[PDB]
Amino acid sequence: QEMVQVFIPAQAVGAIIGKKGQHIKQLSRFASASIKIAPPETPDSKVRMVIITGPPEAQFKAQGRIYGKLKEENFFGPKEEVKLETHIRVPASAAGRVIGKGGKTVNELQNLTAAEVVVPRDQTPDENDQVIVKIIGHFYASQMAQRKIRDILAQVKQ
């Protein structure tokens, strides 16, 4: 049961919601996921944040449909991969294991998946004592990086 934040080009909100919400309802139906779009913290925001809640199966479908819908609506193209920024919140206790001794873990993640993976250093944990990992990649890359991070996280629970 994960939660993920996906930043999409602001001009794509319409496409992602649909006429009278048709598409977003259609997209959660298809993914079985909570899919809320946050209002902008700021008037002229560049991106808008999609918040997606559900288990990995649902994350995969929902995220895939978002990347995919952006391709369709030609916000990227045509010989251009959709790259999106994605945040996941993680136990502030565990985030050091994600970087690894000498940043060798996060290094390998990027090598394996080709996603940029950043743990902004020294952040200030939220209410639930979590910090963010940033992931920028094409679809398959960001999912692979996610799965692996969640792997790492599971281990720390030992």
Side-chain angles (χ1 to χ4, degrees), residues 1-45 47-158:
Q1 176 69 20
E2 318 171 348
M3 184 262 280
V4 168
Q5 306 142 244
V6 184
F7 303 87
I8 59 177
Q11 58 260 45
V13 183
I16 307 285
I17 290 165
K19 287 195 293 258
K20 294 120 197 174
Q22 290 165 31
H23 179 261
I24 194 150
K25 300 179 181 189
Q26 170 191 146
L27 183 37
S28 23
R29 216 171 92 100
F30 174 90
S32 281
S34 298
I35 295 180
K36 316 271 248 180
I37 295 177
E41 273 170 5
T42 52
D44 253 322
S45 52
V47 292
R48 295 277 299 277
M49 179 182 59
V50 185
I51 309 134
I52 302 175
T53 326
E57 324 93 63
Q59 286 296 348
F60 187 78
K61 306 225 306 287
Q63 285 191 232
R65 280 294 312 122
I66 288 158
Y67 273 85
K69 191 68 184 176
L70 295 183
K71 198 41 169 165
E72 300 174 35
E73 306 289 309
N74 267 280
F75 287 98
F76 303 68
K79 277 187 86 141
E80 188 189 4
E81 296 246 45
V82 183
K83 281 196 122 185
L84 297 175
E85 189 173 347
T86 293
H87 301 172
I88 60 186
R89 293 262 164 184
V90 312
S93 46
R97 289 273 306 266
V98 170
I99 305 195
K101 277 190 178 174
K104 308 191 67 158
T105 296
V106 79
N107 170 81
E108 190 179 307
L109 271 164
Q110 298 180 83
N111 285 339
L112 295 200
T113 72
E116 301 162 30
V117 185
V118 188
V119 188
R121 299 303 202 272
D122 293 315
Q123 324 154 29
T124 293
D126 48 33
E127 69 266 31
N128 326 311
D129 194 40
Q130 287 158 326
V131 292
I132 77 165
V133 188
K134 282 158 77 141
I135 307 175
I136 308 77
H138 53 79
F139 177 64
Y140 302 78
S142 150
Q143 305 295 314
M144 189 160 112
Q146 285 198 229
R147 292 308 167 95
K148 299 279 201 58
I149 286 161
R150 309 284 196 181
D151 283 348
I152 295 188
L153 292 201
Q155 312 166 2
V156 177
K157 265 158 239 171
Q158 296 159 52

